[PDB]
Ligand binder design. Structure first.
Ligand SMILES: Nc1ncnc2c1ncn2[C@@H]1O[C@H](COP(=O)(O)OP(=O)(O)OP(=O)(O)O)[C@@H](O)[C@H]1O
Length: 243
């Protein structure tokens, strides 16, 4: 109805005939809102993101897309980089709009870093080019995710190798401004719980199964231990002829 991705009792294994890495998956992602998946290391957040994309085989349950999935803007936990220039890494087979390109660059704070080095927004990077630092690779992948005119945006820990200032500016200018104005569906896996007030929907995962759902107000009563743990980790209220 008003939700983007629906899973009812989904079972997903990475191996073809192994133990279910994801068990009893139930997910109700709102459309046009920010949904944040939180959990410990290796509890299946990236696996949940890829299971919604069909990258994992399904043992049981059903997956519904009300957007026939359609395109999804995805920023992997390991930042993927093409062999082309920075401009083509950000546009990624899209029409080049200078206004949108500069807006996404200012949202990711990529301008002063592309000012460095032999070329500006035209250096070949990845293979057949100069290597970039992990923050630059991650933010170029995030800029590619933010650039495309896609209603669904999947972000898998954009703040893995980012400091406080760049991650905060990325969170505000990208997620709360560049993605809210066009009402794109943003699913944001993160280990930074300081952005939990900015979450319309929250997914809690624990050992390959999903613990809770809803807003922080729902976490206030049903799961008091997890709510107090979130409070302690950071009252959690929302918001040539010679040649
Ligand atoms: N491509 C893969 N092939 C096989 N097993 C995988 C693969 N990706 C993840 N797994 C397994 O699935 C489980 C959860 O991994 P996943 O990457 O979803 O966790 P995560 O919580 O998102 O990651 P992080 O370690 O960054 O917190 C682990 O047991 C891991 O070994």
């Amino acid at each position: 109805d008003n939700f983007c991705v629906q899973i009812i009792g989904g079972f997903f294994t990475w191996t073809p005939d192994g133990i279910p890495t994801l068990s009893n998956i139930t997910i109700r992602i709102p459309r046009g809102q920010l949904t944040m998946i939180v959990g410990q290391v290796g509890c299946g957040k990236s696996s949940l993101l890829l299971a919604t994309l069909g990258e994992m085989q399904k043992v049981s349950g059903a997956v519904f897309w009300n957007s026939s999935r359609g395109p999804v803007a995805y920023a992997s936990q390991k930042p993927w980089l093409l062999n082309a220039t920075v401009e083509e890494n950000i546009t990624f087979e899209s029409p080049f709009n200078k206004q949108r390109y500069k807006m996404v660059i200012e949202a990711c704070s990529l301008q002063p870093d592309i000012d460095i080095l032999p070329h500006g927004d035209q250096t070949q990077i990845g293979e057949r080019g100069i290597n970039l630092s992990g923050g630059q690779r991650q933010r170029i992948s995030v800029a590619r995710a933010l650039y495309q005119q896609t209603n669904v945006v999947f972000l898998d820990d954009p703040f893995s190798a980012l400091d406080v200032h760049l991650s905060d500016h990325l969170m505000q200018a990208g997620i709360l401004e560049l993605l809210r104005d066009d009402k794109r569906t943003v699913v944001l896996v993160t280990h930074k719980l300081q952005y939990l007030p900015h979450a319309d929907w929250i997914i809690a995962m624990k050992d390959g199964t999903i613990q809770r759902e809803g807003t922080l107000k729902d976490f206030q009563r049903s799961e008091c231990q997890l709510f107090e743990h979130w409070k302690t980790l950071m009252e959690l209220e929302k918001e040539l002829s010679s040649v």
